[PDB]
Write a protein that binds this ligand. Structure first.
Ligand SMILES: C[C@@H]1[C@H](C)N(C(=O)Nc2cc(F)c(F)c(F)c2)Cc2c(N3CCCC3=O)cnn21
Ligand SMILES: C[C@@H]1[C@H](C)N(C(=O)Nc2cc(F)c(F)c(F)c2)Cc2c(N3CCCC3=O)cnn21
Ligand SMILES: C[C@@H]1[C@H](C)N(C(=O)Nc2cc(F)c(F)c(F)c2)Cc2c(N3CCCC3=O)cnn21
Ligand SMILES: C[C@@H]1[C@H](C)N(C(=O)Nc2cc(F)c(F)c(F)c2)Cc2c(N3CCCC3=O)cnn21
Ligand SMILES: C[C@@H]1[C@H](C)N(C(=O)Nc2cc(F)c(F)c(F)c2)Cc2c(N3CCCC3=O)cnn21
Ligand SMILES: C[C@@H]1[C@H](C)N(C(=O)Nc2cc(F)c(F)c(F)c2)Cc2c(N3CCCC3=O)cnn21
Lengths: 5, 141, 155, 148, 141, 142, 150
């Protein structure tokens, strides 16, 4: 996963 | 290693230490706030955000620290020595976790940029001698 | 509040505790490995991943624990009470941090699903009585970046 | 030579002294503010502004004054004389650097012309008997070019 | 905070220190020179340049140090004690300020790159044992 | 100056210190290997490579250190100090040179990248409790 | 093995020994010079040159030597024997490092061929009895032709 915040 | 817990959130230990010790709520009040506001998210199988990942660990680390400190406190038989532990915790790791829990709870509630600008405003305000200090302290919103 | 540090990572305290307590490296050895493999990432201004964020706190929390434990050691009169602190952290909290540091360091190196599969495999292998135990223990191994299908497709 | 540190900044020692002594933060609080707001600028290889250049020197100068005052205090035989040195510093050179550090930090933070106007406003406010003094003191609201 | 007063002028404390202490003029002689060469600019209500601004502070700072040492000196009965103060300011802060004032005064007369080139030339020259040392020392132009 | 002898070769002191101290051969065994593998190159008038240049200096530095340490131990007849200098050489400077000699010797044989992968692999393997430790240690190959 | 530290640089120990032991600065002065002149390059992740690689090692070896010598002196309490290590360093290892530091530091500034011609000129000059010795010592460094090719 490529985690966006 | 030299890890600063604030650095991946755009702050630093030195910056959080610009707020005076008595600015922060107690650790108990911060933990009651994290629960009242974020319990469901903190307990979920979702990461939610990097602040939630950090907050989760800090809450658990504080429980570990308190278990240890309680174990020492209760097994001491001298009120002087018990007071020395409490004082040492309140001065050192208690202040650290009040800074860190306040930071993550306030970032999640008001936003990181708002929190950082506020932090520096308050720090300036509180250092101003009372005769010249603005009547209204800065507010987060 | 009831927070499981592994829940957001797809695992649970009960699952990590399926590995025997003596499987895990020491904390010191885990911390050396985190540095050797991930120092630049752990120290950088970037989140990098939830594992990195959690690993950062775990490392600092161990240092908090050790600072407090050492300061308490420094105030004790009795030599036997110092060695009861040592036993105290290394029984109660040492195991818990060895699990957590191993988990994030290994997930960072091999991936969550590889690690959880290996974990239940090793747990079954080590509970097998040695006379019945298979000779080759499970091991974590890195997945290739390019499938064999992909290399053959471009021949 | 007769150099007034404020003159290139459009002020004078006489004008800063129009503020009462207990207006200014402590030197320790001013040095933590300079760090919290400007540390990266203060430590860079860029001039940034004439306030930065002055603040860099003033911070290092206070460091020199403290080293000197500490060596004096260490080497005095009388504990009462150590107190006199501390008192003398706070009433004199300490007040001077509270003024100076406050000035440069406030000019960076709020604007130099704003600070100069504010100074005269506050000195007038605080000299007013409290029965006539307006309830709210004046307050201020939160890279430039500079001519030689 | 870790501030190096030379860094905004392209140099460092370590570099100035490469010159030996007896290379620099005396503080009194450096303040006479600042006055003879630069007084009107130093005294004017204009910035002039970053070197002027720094030089203005260094001069005043030395006055501060000297005012404090003198006030101490006049409240000391023993002439040997005033001597130990005199020796001390010249030993410690004296060198620091001879470096700084020399640097600003020379940069204003001969320019930064000329001064830095010359500085390492002389530092190399003077570390050469005298039997091998070239006759012409480097000079500024 | 703070110089890290490994930096220009893509490594650090901290990284080499990830191998346990008893991983490395004796300095004497690394010196005999450097001679068996590279004596002709080390003694020639050509640079050969930065690793050769660095290895040449470390060999000679060890020579200077032992020359100084023997003169100390030999002018001290008391066995306590004669043996205390050996202990200090073993615990301190010896380990530094075993690291550095092994680094350069292995790099000349297998290359920097193969050596650094190996180092980290072995550093993890040897920290693994024997019950879980994979049967075959990593090695250096091709 | 028999390694000459100067051989890969086109010199030899015997030739550096042609300069007298009081031609060279102290090791301290050569180290402060190496820093003032080459610090950035010495501390960089780039090889830069074989002189930089070798100079890097010598700096650190001097560190090793002085740390060993200090720990010995720290654990010698008799006033006489602490001076014994200083003298030994001064007489033996210090001169070798002063040669080597000077060689690399000068080679990086002026070039091998310049340094070696200088070295031999100076060793001749200083051996010359003062009555006959030229006034100016050698130093480390056409009009018609330059104008002809304008
Ligand atoms: C940041 C300042 C001040 C300095 N405040 C805090 O720090 N509150 C705080 C208290 C906690 F218990 C806690 F866990 C926490 F993280 C922060 C309280 C505050 C507000 N609001 C918004 C609604 C109610 C309120 O007071 C606005 N601006 N401000
Ligand atoms: C200038 C007056 C008053 C007189 N204030 C100061 O002088 N603050 C001050 C404190 C320092 F620590 C310091 F280093 C400094 F240079 C100035 C404080 C102030 C503000 N603000 C803006 C955000 C919070 C606040 O209080 C506005 N108007 N005012
Ligand atoms: C830098 C060197 C040398 C080492 N000199 C100094 O440092 N002079 C110096 C003396 C001061 F009193 C002072 F305050 C200051 F900043 C510098 C003197 C000098 C000259 N010239 C030019 C005109 C006359 C002269 O002597 C040229 N090159 N050189
Ligand atoms: C080789 C001779 C002489 C014999 N000189 C040295 O050996 N200088 C020396 C000093 C050190 F501190 C050091 F670390 C080093 F490597 C060399 C000094 C020198 C120069 N120059 C050039 C600018 C200033 C100067 O004097 C020219 N020719 N010569
Ligand atoms: C790096 C590991 C292991 C950890 N080995 C060493 O470190 N050998 C070592 C011994 C020395 F004396 C020396 F000077 C040196 F630089 C290295 C030995 C080794 C081999 N090979 C290849 C042929 C025979 C062999 O055993 C392959 N992989 N490995
Ligand atoms: C999970 C098992 C076993 C059970 N191993 C561990 O747990 N290693 C370990 C050691 C640490 F010091 C540490 F901090 C950590 F997180 C993990 C070691 C291991 C490997 N590899 C890969 C290269 C070398 C090696 O042995 C593969 N599979 N396995």
């Amino acid at each position: 996963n490529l985690y966006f915040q």
